[PDB]
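worker-03 picked up job from queue 'complexes'. Input manifest follows; two sequence lines, order preserved.
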Amino acid sequence: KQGPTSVAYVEVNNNSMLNVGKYTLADGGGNAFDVAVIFAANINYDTGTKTAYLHFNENVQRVLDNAVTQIRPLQQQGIKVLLSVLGNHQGAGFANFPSQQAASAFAKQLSDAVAKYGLDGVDFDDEYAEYGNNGTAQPNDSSFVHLVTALRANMPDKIISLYNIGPAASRLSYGGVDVSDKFDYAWNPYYGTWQVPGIALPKAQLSPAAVEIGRTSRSTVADLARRTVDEGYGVYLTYNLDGGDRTADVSAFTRELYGSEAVRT
Amino acid sequence: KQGPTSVAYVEVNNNSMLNVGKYTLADGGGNAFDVAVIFAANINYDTGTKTAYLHFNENVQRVLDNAVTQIRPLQQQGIKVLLSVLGNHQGAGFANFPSQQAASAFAKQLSDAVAKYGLDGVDFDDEYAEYGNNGTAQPNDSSFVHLVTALRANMPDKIISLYNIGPAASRLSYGGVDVSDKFDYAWNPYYGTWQVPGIALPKAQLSPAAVEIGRTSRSTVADLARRTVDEGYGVYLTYNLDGGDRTADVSAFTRELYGSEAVRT
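worker-03 finished. Artifact:
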């Protein structure tokens, strides 16, 4: 198995994390997917105390509580498992924590969950935060820097990634500190398109291609996988693998990334 | 019961539409809520044929199929029931239909569902469409105008509303036709804030206030309800009523809108 790291996002409200493990390379026998992401936990906002807090809906909680059966098998098979976090429409986002302390306390919340559930990392998706809702503040220039810096420190050995989207994505440097090097991956959030993330990570850690399995055309899936290889990028983001027979969709990119079609079990 | 029309959005993936009916005015005995919205159906995109189509997840389908038990009781009690539609991250939105025909065919899809399930109208939420995803086109100036014009015609007697947000919201006039007068309501999409929609509807048809039940502070819920009355607006948007005991949250706005506290049954 030689080739770009492929990622699979799974919407746990509707599908099992286990499906990520059913796809292997017909030739290699290796995993078709290298990283699986639990989509997604939330950053809620308590209007009473004006504080953000981490929240798991019952579906996310359910998979976490069943790590032995929902996550362990993936990890034993070699697949890393991250927990994605996104701001709801409550007004709290990754770019509007009022201070290092506010930012640091939430970082601690993320670490304690990773440690507790034995996850391999955290993924940031500043997509629907809706800054200003419920009296929250608009983005500032230090919130994200404080957040990431604190998170990297709490867990120096785990993966921290981010979708290249939203306010937070463009606020990577505050004062004289740039947190770009603190991330392990960055991916294009626009499915079915090619868009090189503007963040300073080496090509091996970037995913300009993004596809939605079962939605984006197979021809487009294959062209973006080929383009990833041609241009020398080392990551290929995939989104929304469900429980149906997606073998053709998967093969569309494994042929290009690893010169092998895929097989479902 | 005299006062602004209050609206309740219910996320059917997690809660019953029926809860909207459990709240009545302690004094009046009238409904605490006048309009209930099923949140939400989707506008999907078929990349094979490059056409948008209406999609109901199993939860939305489940409530529609059970109209006799999930919707009828609300309507018999006097509550109107709308179906909200939103563009996924598939690339198809209300502002990017390639022609009157494309726009008209989807309008027909919405009408046939309203007619089939005996709904009282459609609500447009151009919030997460992600124009350009999967090869779709960016917004244009006629898509929405064609869409609404066609929809109003198919169902001249039903409610058509929209959240004041996204590309579509600002593309209300194409050529010499303005569709603002074709809408019955327009609401602020930003929870916990006051923001008068910029669309040309009379105050009686506008909701500058928007709150999320159980999230936005009760004091803010009460202040925005009072402000609605002070300034003479006739609608008050509420979002995400669940199955818990939200009596205090509800009363926070009924006291202001109708001079009565609410009661749950």
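worker-03 released lock.
The longest helix of chain A spans residues 100-117.
The two ends of chain A are 19 Å apart (CA to CA).
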